[PDB]
Amino acid sequence: TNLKADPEELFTKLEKIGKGSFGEVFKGIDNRTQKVVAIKIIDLEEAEDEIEDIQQEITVLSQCDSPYVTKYYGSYLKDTKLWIIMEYLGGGSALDLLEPGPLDETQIATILREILKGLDYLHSEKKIHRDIKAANVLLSEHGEVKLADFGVATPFWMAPEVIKQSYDSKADIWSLGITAIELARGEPPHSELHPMKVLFLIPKNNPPTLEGNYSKPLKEFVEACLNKEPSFRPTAKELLKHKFILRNAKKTSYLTELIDAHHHH
Numbered sequence: 001t002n003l004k005a006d007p008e009e010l011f012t013k014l015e016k017i018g019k020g021s022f023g024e025v026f027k028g029i030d031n032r033t034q035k036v037v038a039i040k041i042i043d044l045e046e047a048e049d050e051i052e053d054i055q056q057e058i059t060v061l062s063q064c065d066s067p068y069v070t071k072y073y074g075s076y077l078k079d080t081k082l083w084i085i086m087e088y089l090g091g092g093s094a095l096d097l098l099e100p101g102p103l104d105e106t107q108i109a110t111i112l113r114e115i116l117k118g119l120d121y122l123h124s125e126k127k128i129h130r131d132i133k134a135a136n137v138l139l140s141e142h143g144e145v146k147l148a149d150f151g152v153a154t155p156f157w158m159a160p161e162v163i164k165q166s167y168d169s170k171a172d173i174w175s176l177g178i179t180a181i182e183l184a185r186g187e188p189p190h191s192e193l194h195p196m197k198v199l200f201l202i203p204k205n206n207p208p209t210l211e212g213n214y215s216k217p218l219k220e221f222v223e224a225c226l227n228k229e230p231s232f233r234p235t236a237k238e239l240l241k242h243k244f245i246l247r248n249a250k251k252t253s254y255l256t257e258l259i260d261a262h263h264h265h
């Protein structure tokens with residue numbers, strides 16, 4: 001964290017993207033390069049109880065160097081406000097891109113494959129994302145797919161063993177299975193229910209299945225991820241060779257059509 005430089009001289013703050021975790025996020029410009037950045041501004045007096053979680057996400061992101069994890073550029077302290085600088089991904093989140101209408105299975109498989117490449121990276125680095133969901137998957141304007149918003153070390157994407165506070169990288173594989181349902185259907189299982197009910201339903205019930213006129217390989221991909229027994233879930237490495245992925249995923253550049261569809265909607 002840079003406690004001497006003035007982030008307001010280094011960056012031009014533009015429109016708010018939204019309210020992410022801990023603080024508000026803005027599109028911005030690096031005044032030296034003119035590249036577009038994402039800027040999170042956290043009021044450290046308002047958000048004092050969460051400061052250690054902020055620090056640990058900074059540490060984790062600063063240790064990542066992968067095409068599949070959103071790039072971290074640094075942090076700055078100005079008066080009471082912490083500025084966190086990340087690369088700007090102009091395609092939006094996968095959740096955003098569901099808005100115009102359903103994805104097809106080529107788009108689903110392509111997005112899951114890229115998520116799996118990021119999970120393979122993280123798990124090989126002995127890291128766990130802990131919040132895989134469509135809202136935390138960001139696309140560049142070119143269709144590149146990257147992970148953002150790591151979870152801290154809402155229940156709908158949580159593995160049962162995380163809820164029972166009993167976990168390792170296989171929790172991410174469960175969340176990936178929920179995310180696969182989300183990309184196919186628009187919403188995770190139990191999305192109509194109160195979160196406190198979902199908290200006991202996930203451990204209690206059989207795992208969700210993908211319901212609808214979807215290919216059997218896609219239903220099998222979901223079922224493989226959504227086993228109650230973590231040791232029965234496959235690794236990310238193994239899932240990159242799943243027949244659903246191999247038979248349906250195509251070049252990421254094709255996802256620009258999905259980004260364009262969202263702009264015309």
Ligand SMILES: CNc1cc2c(cn1)cc(-c1ccc(-c3ncccc3F)cc1Cl)c(=O)n2C[C@H]1OC[C@H](N)CO1
Nearest residue numbers: 020025038039040057058084086087088089092135136
């Ligand atoms: C739309 N394009 C876009 C959005 C971004 C970011 C990059 N491109 C980067 C971020 C981003 C994340 C974490 C952090 C961060 N937090 C704590 C500690 C360390 C950190 F680096 C900082 C930033 Cl700038 C971002 O919030 N959005 C918006 C966000 O997206 C995903 C949603 N689920 C919610 O909205």
